[PDB]
Design a protein around this ligand. Sequence first.
Ligand code: SF4
Ligand code: SF4
Ligand code: SF4
Ligand code: SF4
Ligand code: FES
Ligand SMILES: [K+]
Ligand SMILES: [Zn+2]
Lengths: 115, 129, 209, 176, 263, 96, 115, 53, 95, 211
Amino acid sequence: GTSVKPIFSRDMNEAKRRVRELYRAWYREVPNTVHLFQLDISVKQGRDKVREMFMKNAHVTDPRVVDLLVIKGKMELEETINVWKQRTHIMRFFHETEAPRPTDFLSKFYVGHDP
Amino acid sequence: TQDTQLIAVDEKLDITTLTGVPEEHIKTRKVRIFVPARNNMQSGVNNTKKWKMEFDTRERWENPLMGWSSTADPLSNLVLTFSTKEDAVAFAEKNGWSFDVEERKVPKPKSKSYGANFSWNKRTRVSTK
Amino acid sequence: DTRPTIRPRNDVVHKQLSAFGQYVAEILPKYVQQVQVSCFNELEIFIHPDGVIPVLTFLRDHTNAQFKSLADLTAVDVPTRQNRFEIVYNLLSLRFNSQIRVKTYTDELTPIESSVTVYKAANWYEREIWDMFGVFFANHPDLRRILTGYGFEGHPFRKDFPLSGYVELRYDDEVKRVVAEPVELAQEFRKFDLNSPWEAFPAYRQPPE
Amino acid sequence: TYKFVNMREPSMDMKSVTDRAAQTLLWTELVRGLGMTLSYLFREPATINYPFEKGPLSPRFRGEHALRRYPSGEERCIACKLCEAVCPAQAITIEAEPRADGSRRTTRYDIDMTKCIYCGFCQEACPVDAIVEGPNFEFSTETHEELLYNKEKLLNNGDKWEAEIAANIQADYLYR
Amino acid sequence: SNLIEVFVDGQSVMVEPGTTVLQACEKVGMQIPRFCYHERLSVAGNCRMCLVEIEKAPKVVAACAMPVMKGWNILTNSEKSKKAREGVMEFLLANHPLDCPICDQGGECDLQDQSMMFGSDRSRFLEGKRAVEDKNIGPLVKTIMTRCIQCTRCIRFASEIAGVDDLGTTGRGNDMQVGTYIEKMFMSELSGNIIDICPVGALTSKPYAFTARPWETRKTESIDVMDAVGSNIVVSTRTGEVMRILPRMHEDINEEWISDKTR
Amino acid sequence: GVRTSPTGEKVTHTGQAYDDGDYRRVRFSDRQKEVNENFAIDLIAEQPVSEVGSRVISCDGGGGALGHPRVYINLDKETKTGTCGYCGLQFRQPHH
Amino acid sequence: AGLLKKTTGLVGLAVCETPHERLKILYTKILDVLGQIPKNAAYRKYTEQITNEKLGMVKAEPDVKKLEEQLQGGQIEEVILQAENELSLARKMLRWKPWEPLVEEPPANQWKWPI
Amino acid sequence: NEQAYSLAVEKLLNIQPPPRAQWIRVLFGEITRLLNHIMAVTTHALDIGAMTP
Amino acid sequence: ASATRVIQLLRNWASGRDLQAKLQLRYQEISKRTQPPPKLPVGPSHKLSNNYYCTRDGRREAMPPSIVMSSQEKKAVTPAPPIKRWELSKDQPYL
Amino acid sequence: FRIDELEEMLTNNRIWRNRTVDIGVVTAEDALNYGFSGVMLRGSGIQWDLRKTQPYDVYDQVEFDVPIGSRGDCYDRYLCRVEEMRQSLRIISQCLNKMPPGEIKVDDAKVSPPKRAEMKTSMESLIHHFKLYTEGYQVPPGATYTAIEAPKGEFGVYLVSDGSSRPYRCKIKAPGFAHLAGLDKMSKGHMLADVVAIIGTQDIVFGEVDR
Ligand code: SF4
Ligand code: SF4
Ligand code: SF4
Ligand code: SF4
Ligand code: FES
Ligand SMILES: [K+]
Ligand SMILES: [Zn+2]
């Protein structure tokens, strides 16, 4: 039950290590993917998107889950590095065409039936 | 007996971030599990023998063209089957959807006898067949 | 004859396959869990995950088994069972022409060891499962996404995944590119309620409780 | 049984080697193909003068959907919605109603031609031969909305291609 | 106590004395196809689809009204039982009119489902069928009495459940017609429930009459608010629109019936 | 019969007619609202009432196999005319 | 063997001009490897049975063409190829050790397939 | 492909097609084989350069 | 869409064959497109007697997969008897 | 008379062979482990064909030879395809000469729609057609892997049905998937014109590999 099989990491410390050089690679990547892909993104506003995506899954505490996010980010890194990904997919993280979505209950009531 | 470097992991699964469901669909959506009541137009029974999960219905507007039933939530015509309610609730929590539980209503077995159609004094005597 | 519509029954192949099933069950009792042969003469072997490499090798190498062809490799997601995903390996023999099937189980996270070495055809098939069910494969040479679009999410063949997906893409002149947008159908998929409430096959009735 | 395709190894006598050397040097199989293509040049060109001449067809041809009607003029569709439950692409949509006369005709009957995959499942599903696919294929349109048909458009299709559909059904109902 | 052991096609179960055979079979999970017996209504043994073979017994017995006895392995899947079901349905499905595309019961007809499961695949009826003139019994129930099978469920519902004993039978033989003889006005508060007890489309819902084939409408559970009883119901909605309200089984609130006002 | 809307549009056999404001009428400007004139409501009414003299009458809709499934309507009620649900021809006893 | 066959017909392997001694040496090696395998294992019984049978027939009949006929394994080249594979299998699962009882039962109902 | 799918389906159902159905199936599957081999060879020659075949 | 004999002999010699026996064209030899109404036959179970579906159902006559071995001196057995060797082509063994 | 006509243009031509002969060899042993099928196997030299070894339908009663490759190269596979054309013509003749008299669909109406005559006259046919086109034939629970000799290669379906009117999971084994999986080992030093000569007898349509 509680006992389970790991993917790579044994404890939160080593998975915490893997996300470390994943962020390493993303940092060293962002500028030259901006240069290579002719991005309209800027360098700083490239890095902070990586930071916000890394902070998005802050709640995760199961190790195996952390290995899963790290290997999926690894696949993301390969897709970006050797130009298999395309500029549109890179922009996909930045929500340009997506209109701003209200947050307060009052605006939700004004717009339509939705929780 | 199955040595694969086993580790006690007490907290429940959080595969939510793995499933790729968007944040508002994993948070706002409320799913209920239930045994679907049989269609009263039918006497068939083998449709209330499974645990199905379905999600809250959302906006259904009519498109300008033919008044179709265009909708926005993808998880509207999505129903999942399960043998026992424990499997369904485990799936619900591990995925991360706020879940609601309804107990499996079953017909009470009633004593039925054809000899009740006729009687000497009881009111149960029928008046026509 | 008397049964011109019913398919012919070949009991000889059935008995012979059952004999080979007892054979393979005796040879590898460590990983084999349950072997059975279907009515239409198709044998299936239910093995523990740790036997993905050993059993396959025994089926790929043994003189009296002689299976070297990976017909296909597939996962069948079923959310009910505790380990939802089940992986099916389909093998075909050449010297002893026949089709065998071995089936293992895994959940979303517990990895299942990647065959590849036993059958180098599995590789691409292997990737599909990872890219289509979330079943990660241990030490697979390159487990990158194979089928779906770039930067995708989830694993579509999961039965919880909606039919229409989550996000489409289309031209936007405001940004002069194809952009991804949350789903908004022009007409919703009508889900018909088939499967009449009357029992079809008394033979396969689930026992009560 | 089987046949080996390429085991015809050559001999090595003086005649055979001279022939092979001549074929390699004095290009012969090259000339063989060069003369075959010449034979095809002088032949009768296979070409149909569209649109003056059209390709051969069959009475079973599946094309534009249409709603037929009885000889009395009444539409055959009783809105059983079998065709809607059959269309694999779900291109058919019906809303029924008790008409003023009473006969349960369709308030709405639209086929999304851009969703349709032209299978002929609807006609074989129809128990009154109401929905059918006419022999017309010449309905390439300019706007996407032009393709999305309506009940009135289907009725007009059944009233324009009608002698066609009646003749084809008369020549095909025995097969089906 | 008094629980008597009764086998069903093999495995045995504990059965209360006086229990009908069909309830004993239901105790295991396999269900006798039926048209005359409703669980909350009196039994009549009329459809004869409840026939089943008793092990070492010459003639088949009706599982609807049969007090089960000691032992008595119920051969549900016996060849004689299948033949009896086949013949009884062939008789049922002889004069049935060709209205399946035009009858609202289509797709949830019961009779259609039993034909799919336990029935033939071809008709040897070489003669003409029977037609019965329609008797109007309201703006609330559509009446096509040529489709009726004389299962007597409507009559027993009128007598016991509603209490308005006006729905009966007339004549004899194959010309027996179930109706009201007089052009009477069946206007009880529970009349609409006859729409859901009629196995065939002989009685249907007039307000909903041919608005949607019921294999499309999604079903969502809810509670009636027209009355303080709060009867459990199911709303059948297609394409973002409410079509009809059907009763849900609760056994504590509304059994499986609702008022015409609620419906 | 086809009749014109107060705006001017041709009503359909179902009764559809876009109202006065009804912004969804720009679709028809520079185009036409396709309506079929051969109304099925009235094209079945003028058909003669068949006077076949028997209690129960078969109807396939004409054309044999090409018609609708064979239905047996009942020519019993003296106060009205029986009709096949599929086609719609009104059958009646020849005044008994 | 008379005129040695030019090609076996399968391009993945060539002709062994001295096949009998190859059968002998490979069979002896795999018999040794099975001698390693503990007696109680059913694998050793079955494979020793088939291999000692095969060695008996190959050392009995010295004509290659009849060797393929009573060996029912096609051309002798794919036969020694399969013998090498059998050696490899026995060696590889020497330390896999499958003769032990099952590692553990499947979890509850993991094989019933009416859902 | 239709032959494959159909054969799977009525293999599940323990049903065999009538003999004429089998003969039509094999005849049209072989016509399909001719079609597909023509595809392969002709389009291959197109890639290599040959346009006439 | 036949030709002149002068061209007819030129194409045949260039093609090295007698192609007039059959051209890629298709002349009047085609099947007529107004065939008489075919009376289609029936199947085996078309009789009105002894056609009980109980003795003819195929789906109902399907048992669950027969369990062989479950987790809850025989010789060696092969999945199939070794496949034989095909024969060479009698017509054209080698192309 | 046109199959041979194509042959004469391609078979003995200098540059058709030179561009294609002995480019991208595939070893017979390494072919079957890679999951290769169809002519890809037959080109290399393994005598295997589902039409003969596992005869589905009436393929067993049909007499035909298969073309078996010699060198396992591109040219051998092309010749195998053409000889398959010719054996296809012979098979066509055989089935054309001996088609029997009988119905077209299984007589059991519960699985195949009834004929339109009994549709409009008989109750049973009407109900069966209504349910068949409304619900369909509910399939008994079970999983099958059905494989046939599609012209590309062996084509298979893993169809697993839960026991209702709808399937539970169908998987497509397309002959081109394992082919493209092995396409890396297929060309390991040949030129770009060679890789495009390879994807030809690789005969990979991108409609079934991609699913
Ligand atoms: S051919 Fe007709 S029935 Fe079939 S998908 Fe297209 S519109 Fe629907
Ligand atoms: S199947 Fe025919 S009759 Fe039924 S709804 Fe469709 S078109 Fe109308
Ligand atoms: S009630 Fe009668 S007409 Fe209606 S679907 Fe059932 S059998 Fe057909
Ligand atoms: S009218 Fe309906 S409920 Fe009454 S007897 Fe006939 S079928 Fe049964
Ligand atoms: S239950 Fe046997 S007839 Fe009604
Ligand atoms: K009813
Ligand atoms: Zn009529």
